[PDB]
Structures are given as structure tokens and as C-alpha cells.
Amino acid sequence: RKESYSVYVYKVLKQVHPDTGISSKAMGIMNSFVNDIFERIAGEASRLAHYNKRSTITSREIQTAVRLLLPGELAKHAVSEGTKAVTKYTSS
Amino acid sequence: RKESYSVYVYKVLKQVHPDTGISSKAMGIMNSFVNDIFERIAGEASRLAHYNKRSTITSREIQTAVRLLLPGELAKHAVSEGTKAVTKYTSS
Amino acid sequence: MDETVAEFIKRTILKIPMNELTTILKAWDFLSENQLQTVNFRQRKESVVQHLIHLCEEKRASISDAALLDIIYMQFHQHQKVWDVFQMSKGFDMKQFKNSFKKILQRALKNVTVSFRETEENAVWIRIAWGTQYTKPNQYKPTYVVYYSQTPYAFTSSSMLRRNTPLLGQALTIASKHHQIVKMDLRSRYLDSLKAIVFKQYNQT
Amino acid sequence: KGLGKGGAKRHRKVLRDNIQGITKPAIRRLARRGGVKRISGLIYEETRGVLKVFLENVIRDAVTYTEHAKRKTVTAMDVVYALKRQGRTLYGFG
Amino acid sequence: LRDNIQGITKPAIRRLARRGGVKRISGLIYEETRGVLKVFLENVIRDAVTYTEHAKRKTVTAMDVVYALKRQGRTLYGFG
Amino acid sequence: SRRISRRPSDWWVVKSEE
Amino acid sequence: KSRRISRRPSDWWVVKSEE
Amino acid sequence: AKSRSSRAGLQFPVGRVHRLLRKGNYAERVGAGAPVYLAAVLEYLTAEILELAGNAARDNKKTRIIPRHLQLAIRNDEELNKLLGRVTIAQGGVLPNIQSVLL
Amino acid sequence: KAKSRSSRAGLQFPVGRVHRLLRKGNYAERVGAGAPVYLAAVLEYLTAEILELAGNAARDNKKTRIIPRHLQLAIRNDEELNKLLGRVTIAQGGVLPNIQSVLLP
Amino acid sequence: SRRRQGWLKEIRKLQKSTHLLIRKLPFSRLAREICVKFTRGVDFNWQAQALLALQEAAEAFLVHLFEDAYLLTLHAGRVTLFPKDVQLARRIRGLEEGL
Amino acid sequence: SRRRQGWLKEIRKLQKSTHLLIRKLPFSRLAREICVKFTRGVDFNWQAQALLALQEAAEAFLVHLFEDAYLLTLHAGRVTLFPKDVQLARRIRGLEEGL
DNA sequence: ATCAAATATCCACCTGCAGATTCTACCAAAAGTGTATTTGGAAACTGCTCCATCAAAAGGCATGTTCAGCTCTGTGAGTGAAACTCCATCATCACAAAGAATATTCTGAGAATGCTTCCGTTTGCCTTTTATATGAACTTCCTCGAT
DNA sequence: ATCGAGGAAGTTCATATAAAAGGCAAACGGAAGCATTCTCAGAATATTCTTTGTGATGATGGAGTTTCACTCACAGAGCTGAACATGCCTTTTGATGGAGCAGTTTCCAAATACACTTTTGGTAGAATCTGCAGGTGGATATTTGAT
């Protein structure tokens, strides 16, 4: 009854490696990794909308949450692959 | 227009010192001490009500948050002085 | 007073349902009923038990008499624990028996299983806890033995702690005026089912 | 320290060892992974000190989540949560 | 090669480490502490100008530094 | 009430029951 | 997918000059 | 015509805690007995770090608590250290610490 | 009928499960429409970046199935994934094969 | 012979693998004794996933302590550790990463 | 006298008081330079509380680095510091207390 | 040795910035009385899951004796940093005008909530099918050590 | 050189353990279209706050010489902690029934928001009224080190 991200992660593995498998406990780490980045980003983005006297987590206040919760070189490639996934969703 | 605790903390000092004064910058530290304890405790008691999947922060789910955010001997008094506040609040 | 008696009483009371909570405390005979007037029972059980703790903190709060509260609790919940039937032979109110109830394991405590609450139909209720020679006893996995001073049958609760089945028979046969103890085919849930299988075969031979 | 006092029966209530199950070569083989090329003869007493004060800063955070939701069983999610507030996030069992 | 980082002057770093209990400073800590201080100010002002450029202003205020040190791990009790 | 306030707080050295 | 430059830990307790 | 705080006997405002603790969305529903019990713990700490500082005012013979005397009241306590672990103080200073070993 | 928002975004991580979790956590009162498409990208790029390194962990150790050791040699041998996961000890893990300096013969 | 090689066979062996290093049943009887000094009286009940959740944190903590304690032995010209080099490796560490 | 006493009378003077130890206008000209290497081209504008907010952290972090880094001098039998004693004290704190 | 300028203390003054005190008026917040609503205690029961034994089972640890690579202390060549006399230039305070930038007030429109219908997609669940890995043997290969 | 002995890849091989394909129910959630709801960008405007400039200014840092205390290699006295070899007691496995205890479902009332209420005292902020701290000087009291 409890849902994972396991089927979605397995599609990412086949997209970047045609044959690489994954063990079951290795799928367990790929869950509690991707909730830890999720709870950091969507937890720290809450603090900005509580700071700047707003009420809506928008598509902008994840972007300044990405530029803090990541180190240097991994930031600029994440955000530039970030906004590309918004523009084609807009002009679909 | 931003409110502080400055009239409150000054009344606490008179209960344990009849003649001690406080400088106007030391009241500023007694702001960000008491909000930092406040923004921890309610910001950590939210995690228990999200864990057990209830929706009421009661007078119980602060108590197990008090026993985490404090060290050893400061725990036993702050909960025992805490429960002295509720018992003469109900039986009024 | 001690400090583990506060955690023990707080967890003992919450096992009782709200129906018979006033039946137990009037029959347990430990606190003054004028304090029961002060304890308003019609409110939340979280605030019920703490006032019961606070009205036991102003008294002696001994672990011996707080153990007696669990014994009366087991008399009114006999449909949960699984029971067993022993019987002795090779040899009344058993007055010389009660003189030395506790003749076992002298290096551990003065009395590990002390219990003084007698019941009619010659029923003795003794709460048997267990420990070892350098460990404190464990007050939450007990063993209950109901023995009669006329029938040599002993009604024994199932022991969640293993390894101590025949020494319980040795601590009961040597302390009595007997020599033999057996293990019959009587292990059921109830005590009225232990009437027509024990009181029918023994009392009408 | 030594609360729930030992002498309820007699002195020396340490009956077999109760602490020395962390064996002599076990603390060796822990340090052999870290790059300790040679261990002095007092670390066998020292690591038993540090490992006792690591459990009292986990289990106090771990039994409290257990005693909160009124249970008698510490779960796997309780220890993962207790180390998460501690500062040592664990990706095994969450 | 003139100025703009040697404003952290030569006896000022000395009088810092006097407070920590350093009896006698060697001859490279005068360059070493100027290295630590530059890699401390790039892990604050990055997080501090981020809050300013987010809520669209041009002024880094007092609350723009107390927050960015709170997310860093160094909560400050002076100004917030 | 009053608790015990311990002035040095020597905490890094492990210390046994003696 | 594209590529970033991912360096082995590139010893960081030793302070770096521009050179 | 009764203040909530005078029902408890403490001093910190019950209602101002009860006002803030809904506006932050810490939970969608806030119990009645909670912001009394939080108003004790927030006072017992602020009545603890003052009494140490207030006894630090006479011992250095300045009758007004200046922000030095908070720094020497926090770091000279075992149990208040672990609470304010990753926290510095403005206008702080350090403990008087040299050891003999350096001197 | 092109109604899967993930396929509309050209991503692979889901969109609607992120949009469901941004309200049951109480992170704000209203959650924007353009937000959880931007959160379903950054978690993809932080999932494709680890497994591309963990994919080269199994190939250079001559096995075909990524075991939890292979993430430990994938994360720590990055620069920036160290400083991201500074508080994370991976279970069934291991440490880096650190040949020290003064152990050289 | 007398001394073929004592340790350098063993360190490169143990860093290669990923086992556990403290045996489970003593490591359970250390926890249950310390679990009963808190929450007095009631010895609790442990899921078997919980004991394998401390042991992948304890034997990942101490292996990070000893390695980071070993960089103090090389700073003093020694090779062997001492309890100087663990007492000093906790005080520098700073009160939140092992007390 | 050849030397009366230099270091001991100066240290117990400085721990007694609560100054700031870096002069403000160089510390402003250090901060504005680092601010303009980010946020390309366009400068910014600083309130006079924020420059007294870093200086109550930078001279609260460097002073807490030196007292911690000095305990690695006494562990080697030295007295003087070195960059062997600062480049080791940024390590053991482990990536979140000075990098 | 006393003379000697420091090192330190107290006693009295003395502004002068700094808290402290009314008193504001009233805005804003809180306190009270019901209306109508609901989470969560509280009781009872299924059945997953873990303590507590017995037992091969050996794998791994405990004890004792040795030994070569350490740890500790002292010396002395060689040195790298505090101390100190000068002196300029770079940090500071005050100001004042200039203003870019911030904050408040005020309006409406594209954007989020909300209920509903209808499908697709994501689960647990075997289920069968399929495979990699690992442990074993296995030999051939082949570094390394004793004549 | 000569050649014995492990040590180490390198190969083969069965083999369960674990995982991938499949399937489909199906319980659940993402989605469309719609109806209605508002938070927040955009523009106009008083106005806090901060940059840029000046001239005094002098405390304070940069340069240099030095003298002593300190870091560094070498060598020898002492002791301590790895290899080792060998019983044996202790940790594993597993299989065990029992079951305490976790998880589910079902009721319902005692506690919670809505909201307008009237109150109201209560806090924040604004001029007035004190006095505690820092600095100066009163320089007397006192231990520093040279004749």
C-alpha cells in the first residue's frame, strides 16, 4: 500500500545504461536518497515564502532553493536543465 | 510595528532580581534566543504530527519535543515545570 | 519510595477499561475514597492517571503493594492468559506451607514473588516474577499460580519466560508437604472450562 | 552513570561481562579499516567508552519516538528518524 | 598587486590569534588566515546575495545575513 | 527550583566510574 | 545527457593559491 | 475579564504564542492545552539564562547586564552549552582561557 | 489524449505525485502550477548524475548489477557529491581505499 | 618464517569488503542493557531491522572516527595511536559529531 | 630589561575585552569586491548592520578556528603554529565547519 | 640593600549617552458566548512478527611468550619570530546634499482551488522464467623464497 | 643460476539466490472541463537610508635590526605491542511453537474552528525624567627590578 519511486528510477537507469541491473537494497538507497533531497528542497522553499510575506510556492521559489541546497558546479547545470523542463511544458 | 518580547522578558528579570537592569542591546539577544527556541520546538513538533499522521499539535506532542531539544538534567525540570502549567490551567 | 514504581503504576492502570476502573480501585484498597471524590473520572484518561500518580506520590508507593494491583487485574481478565493444570501427590489450609512460600533463590532477593491476597474456594493468588542472581527482576512477564489447599491441583498461567517450568514445580512441591508433580493434558484459555474437567473428575470419584 | 543500581542482590553484578561482548579483535578490525597501522594497549578500554556514549545519544532520541506513539516496539523508522534529528542521516531503511 | 585583500592587516591577524591563546605565530599564518577568510566569505555572500536577488531588491540587509548563516549552520543572535 | 550548574564541563575525556 | 567536469576529491584541507 | 496567562501563573503571553502557532502552518489544527505548555518552557529557559547572568552581574560588579554577561553565562554551564551549540553571540568575547602549559 | 504531464514535460520522474506531496506536507497554502514540473526535473538530474557514475562503478569492477558498495565509490569519488551528502553514511557501504602517505615502502 | 607480513595483508583486505565487524548477539546485549536504563522497568522489544540499523551507523561512525583520529598520530611523528589521539579527536570535532 | 613581557600581558588584555579586531573600512572593501565577482557586472548596496553582521561572525569564526587549531600545536610538542596546524584543523571538522 | 617608575586600587567627580517612566490613544489583539463540526481517544480482534530454547557447529576468541620496531629523553647546530625605535599614510568621524532605492497604497486578471467523470498507470502478487555471482574446485600460471 | 612453494589470477561449473518479465486486478490517483475564487504583478508616490565627497588627524601599521628562544635531526636506553600457536567456550543457524503486541475497523463525544461579539487591557510607540557606566583625576597603596 506504501508507494515508492522505484519504477520511475528503474526507467532512468535504462535510459543511461542499456544493460545495468540494480539490486533490491540498492533500490532502497535510491528511495531514501531522493526523499532526502526532496525534503530539503521543499522544506527550505517553504521558508522563503514564509519570509517574503507571500503564500504560494511558485516555480520561482524552487529555483532559489536549488541554488542553495547544491554546491557550485552542480548548480549551474541543474538549473539550466531545470528551466528547460518548464518552457516546453508551457508551450506544449 | 514588528512586535518583540521586550516588555515580557523585562518582567521575568524582576521576578528573580529586584534591581538588575538590562542594556538595550542585550534585549536584542533575548529576542533571537527565544525565537530560536520557539522556531525549533514548534518546527520540530510538526514533524511528529506529520509522522503519526494526526493533525492536532496537542499539549502532549510538545512534551516529547521538549525531551529531544534539551540535554540531560535540563530535561527533567523543564517538563516538570511544564506540567505544572497545564494542571492549574485545567483545574481553574 | 522507589522510582520504577511510577512507571509501573502508570502502565498498570491504562490496561484497565473505563468500565470497571472504579470497581478495581474500591476493591484494591490502597487509597482513600475521599481522594477518589477529588479524582474527576469523567475527563480525559491522560489527566486521570497523573492525578492518580500524584496521589500515590504523597504515599509510600511500594513495589510490593503496587504489584498487588496487577493481581486483582488478572482475576477479572481470566479470558486472556493461557492456563495449565498441575497436581501434587505423595503426602487443610496449608498453614505450614504459607510459613515458607518463598523458599527458592536466596541470593537474588529476600522475596521476588511476594504476594498476600487470599481468595475463597481456598484460592491463593501469587504473582511470580523472575530474575537471576545479578539482574533485577522483570515485572512485565509474570507467572500466575492458583493453588487450592484441599485439592492438590494447581492452576498455573503459561510462562512467557521459558526454561523455568520444572523449577516452578520444584519451588511449589518442596515448599508444600509433597514429593511429586506432573504435567497433564489441560492447557486451555478459560477457568470455567477448568471446572468441569478438574472439579468433575476429582470431587466425584 | 550507574543508575538502576547493581547491588540489589550482591556486589559485582557484571555477571559474565555485559559490556565486554565488544571483543578484543573486534575493536582491532574496526581500526584496521580506518588505517590504524598499530593500536596502543589502552584503546581497548577507550573505544568501549566512546561506544557507550554513542548509544546514549541515539537510544534517548530513539526510545522517545517509540514511547510517544504508545507502543512497546522500537521500529526501523524510529532509529532512522532519531539519527536524522541527530545529524547523521542514514539511507538504509527509510 | 597593490591592495584590496591586504586590508586584513599584518598585526590584525596577530591580535585575532591572541584571543584564541596562541603564544607565538609562525611566518605563514599571516598568509594562511587570509586564505581561510576568502573561502569563508565566498560561502556566506553566495548564500546572502541569493536571498537579496530572490525577493527583488538591490540592498543586502541585516536579515539577509542572519538567514544565510542560519542555513549555513552558524545561527547568530545579534540582529534577527 | 535549583539544579546543579557544573562550571568546567570537561566532556571530551572519557571518564569511568572511578 | 550532457557532461559536467567531475573531479576526484582534489585535496581541500590544503589552502589553494590562484597558482 | 481574565487573561489566559494569569490562569497559568506564568508571565509570557499565552495568546501571542497561540496566535503565531497557527499562522506559520505548523499544523492545520492547534490544541487548547498546547500554547500554555509551550509558554512554560519558553519562560523556564529565559528564567534560567538570566539568573546565571544576573549572578554574573554582581561578580564582575556592573549592575546592568551588558551582552558580555550573556556570553559568560552560557559558556560557563555544561547543560546550556549543548543547547546553544552552533550559535555565536554578537559583541561576545570568549571565556578567560590561557593551561601554564603555554605560560 | 496526451494527458500525462510527465510525457508533456519530456521528463521521466512523475509530476502528479510531486504535486500531491507538496500539499499533504503543509509547505504552503497554495502550490503553483509551474512549480512541481521544476521539481521533477532537478530530482531527475540528481538521479541521472549518480547512476551515470555508479554505472561506471560496476563496469570497472567487472560486475553487471549495481550493489550498494558501488554507490559508495560513486558518490565519494566525486567532488561535489561529497559536499552535498556530507551527513550521509550509506548502509552496507564501505570506505575509500585510502593508501596513506607514511605507509609507502 | 618469523614475520612474513603482519598488517598490510589485513588492511587492504578489510577496506576491500563491506561486512560487519562487531558480532550481532553481543551488540544486541549491549543495547538492551542500555535501553533499560532509560524508560525504567519495561525492557522493550526490538525489530530485527533496528539492530542492523545501529550497526550500520555505529560501525560507520567509529570507522570515521579512527581514520580522522589517525591524522593526529602522523602529526606528532608517531605511528601508533594513543588515548591522547582519541580524546583530542573528539574535542576538535566540535560537540555535535560525537560526544 | 631586555624584554619585560610581551605576549602574556597582551593576551589577557584582549580576552578581557570585547572589541572588533579588523578595521572596518578594509573589511568593507574586502566584502564589496567578493560581492561583485558574483552577480555579474551589477554592483549592490549594503546596510551598515550587515557589515557589522559579518564582523560578528568572521571575527567569531577565525577566533574559534585559532583556539581549536592551537591544540594541534601542543600535541606535537611544539609551541608555534604552522600551516600544518590550520590545514589539519579545517579537515577534522568535516566539510561543514569551515571549508 | 632603597630608589624607582610602574602595576594596581580606591575615592570622588562628572557628564552624557543611555535606560527608565508616564501616558498616551487606540490600534490591534485578545477574551467571551455560542454554533455547528470532527479528529482522535477508546474498545475489540486479526494475525504478523519477535523473544526464549535447544544444539550442532565451528569459527573465532582467550592466554601466554617472544621480539624488533617502535616511544621517550637529551643535545646541539642552526634559526625564524618577538621586541622596539621611528614615522607616515591610511582608517575615521562629521556632515550634507544628493538620490537611488525602498516601502505603502491601490487595482484587476491570469492563476489555484474545488467538485466531477473516466481512464491509465502503478501497485502488490505471484508467477514463471531467467540470470549473475559466488563459492568451489581447478589447473595452469607464475611471483617469491630457500639451496 | 637453481628450483621449491605458495599465491594468484583465470577458467569452468553447478546452483540457489535474487532478480526480470508478465499479468491483471483494481484500488488509487492523475486529468479534463468547468465554475468560481483571489493572490500578486504593475504602476504611482512619499520618503528612509546610503553612497560619494571633504578635511581634519593621529592612532596605528610598515620597515628594519636584533637577540634570544625556539624547531629539527641523530642516537642511544628502555618497553611495549604485534605474530604465533592452540584448546575451548561462545555466536551462529534453524527451527521452534506461542504470543505479546502492532495494525484495523468501528463509534461518538469531548475538544476545536467560525465568527461576530464587546471589551480592554495591553503593547507599541512617543517626550520626559533619571543615574549608571566610562573616563579623568584623586594620583595613595603596593610589588615589580636596578644600585
Asked whether residue I20's C-beta has any atom of DNA/RNA strand M within 7 A, the reply is: yes
Q: Which nucleotide has the shortest C1'-to-CA distance from C48?
A: L41
Nucleotide L68's nearest residue (CA vs C1') is J3
CA of C23 vs C1' of L49, distance in Å?
35
* Inter-chain residue contact D81 with B61, CB threshold 8 Å: no
Residues of chain F in Cβ contact (below 8 Å) with chain J? 11-14
Touching pair B, E by Cβ (3+ pairs < 8 Å): yes
- Neighbouring CB atoms inside 10 A of I23's CB total 14
Contacts of J56 in chain I (CB under 8 A): 89, 91-93
Method of determination is cryo-EM
Burial B47-57 (b: 16+ CB within 10 A, else e): ebbeeeeeeeb
The reply to whether D85 touches chain A by the CB within 8 Å rule is no
Does an H or E element contain K9, and which? helix K7-14
Q: Among J21, J52, A42, which Cα is nearest to I38's? A: A42
Contacts of A29 in chain D (CB under 8 A): 91-92
Does an H or E element contain H56, and which? helix H49-59
State whether CATH 3.40.50.2000 applies to domain H1-103: no
Give F18's DSSP letter.
Answer: -
Contacts of F11 in chain J (CB under 8 A): 95, 99
The reply to whether C139 touches chain J by the CB within 8 Å rule is yes
**CA torsion, ordered D70, D57, A25, D66, to nearest 10 deg:** 0
Distance CA G13, CA K88 (A): 7
Beta strand B21-22 with H64-65 is parallel
Distance CA I42, CA I86 (A): 19
What size, in residues, is chain J? 99
Does an H or E element contain B43, and which? helix B34-51
C-alpha cell at D36: 590504524
Identify the residues numbered 46 to 75 in chain I whose C-beta atom is closer than 7 Å to any atom of strand M.
65
* Breaks (C–N over 2.5 Å) after residues, chain A: none
Say which residues have a Cβ less than 8 Å from residue I12's Cβ, sequence separation at least 6.
A8, A11, A12, A15, I6, I44
Does an H or E element contain I55, and which? helix I35-59
The reply to whether J34 touches chain I by the CB within 8 Å rule is no
Strand partners, C123: C119, C148
Identify the residues numbered 47 to 66 in chain A whose C-beta atom is closer than 7 Å to any atom of strand M.
49, 54-56, 58
CATH number of the domain at J93, please: 1.10.20.10
End-to-end Cα spacing for chain F:
30
C-alpha cell at C179: 514429593
Distance CA B78, CA B64 (A): 12
- Answer yes or no: are the C-beta atoms of D67 and B52 closer than 8 Å: no
SS3 K34: helix
Chains in contact with D via at least 3 Cβ–Cβ pairs below 8 Å: A, B, C, F, I, J
Q: Among K58, K64, K63, K66, which Cα is nearest to K34's? A: K58
From chain J residues 26-85, the ones with a CB under 8 A of any chain C CB are 39-43
C-alpha cell at G16: 589553494
Interface test with D, best of B48, B67, B68 (most D CBs within 10 A): B68
Distance CA C195, CA J88 (A): 71
Strand partners, C180: C89
Residue K68 domain boundaries = 1-99
What is the Cα gyration radius of chain K? 18
Residue the block writes with cell 541569493: E50
- Answer yes or no: are the C-beta atoms of C16 and C73 closer than 8 Å: yes
Count D/F contacts: CB-CB distance under 8 Å.
Answer: 7
Distance CA C130, CA K23 (A): 73
Strand partners, C181: C88
From chain H residues 33-62, the ones with a CB under 8 A of any chain B CB are 33-34, 36-51, 54, 57
Distance CA I7, CA J26 (A): 53
Distance CA K48, CA K45 (A): 10
Chain centre to alpha carbon of residue C104: 17
- Answer yes or no: are the C-beta atoms of K88 and K49 closer than 8 Å: no
Nucleotide L91's nearest residue (CA vs C1') is K25
Q: Which of I45, I47, I50 sits opposite A81 (nearest CB)?
A: I45
Q: How many separate helices (H) and strands (E) can be counted in chain K?
A: 5, 1
CATH number of the domain at B80, please: 1.10.20.10
SS3 I89: strand
Distance CA J72, CA B45 (A): 41
Resolution (A): 3.6
Distance CA C120, CA C146 (A): 11
Name the CATH superfamily housing domain I1-105. Answer: Histone, subunit A (1.10.20.10)
- Positions of chain M reached by protein Cβ under 7 A: 7, 18-20, 28-32, 39-41, 49-51, 60-62, 67-68, 70-72, 80-84, 90-92, 98-104, 110-113, 119-125, 132-134, 145-146
CATH number of the domain at D53, please: 1.10.20.10
| Total number of domains in chain K | 1
Contacts of H68 in chain K (CB under 8 A): 18
- Measure Cα distances from J57 to D92, H53, H61, J53 in Å: 10, 39, 50, 7
Residue of D nearest to J51 (CA): D76
* Inter-chain residue contact D2 with F17, CB threshold 8 Å: yes
End-to-end Cα spacing for chain E:
38
The reply to whether H87 touches chain K by the CB within 8 Å rule is no
Greatest Cα pair distance, chain H, in angstroms, is: 66
Contacts of B90 in chain C (CB under 8 A): 47
Whether the CA torsion K27, K28, K33, K39 is positive or negative: it is positive
Residue the block writes with cell 505423595: C90
* Inter-chain residue contact K99 with I83, CB threshold 8 Å: yes
Q: Among C86, C83, C85, C87, which Cα is nearest to C190's? A: C83
Residue A46 domain boundaries = 1-92
Strands (E), K12-91: 45-46
The reply to whether E70 touches chain K by the CB within 8 Å rule is no
- Neighbouring CB atoms inside 10 A of I60's CB total 10
Residue D52 domain boundaries = 1-94
Compute φ and ψ for I102, nearest 5 degrees.
Answer: -85, 20
Compute φ and ψ for A13, nearest 5 degrees.
Answer: -65, -40
| Total number of domains in chain D | 1
Q: Among H28, B53, A48, which Cα is nearest to I35's? A: A48
The reply to whether J71 touches chain I by the CB within 8 Å rule is no
The reply to whether A43 touches chain D by the CB within 8 Å rule is no
Q: Which of I48, I53, I76 sits opposite G1 (nearest CB)?
A: I48
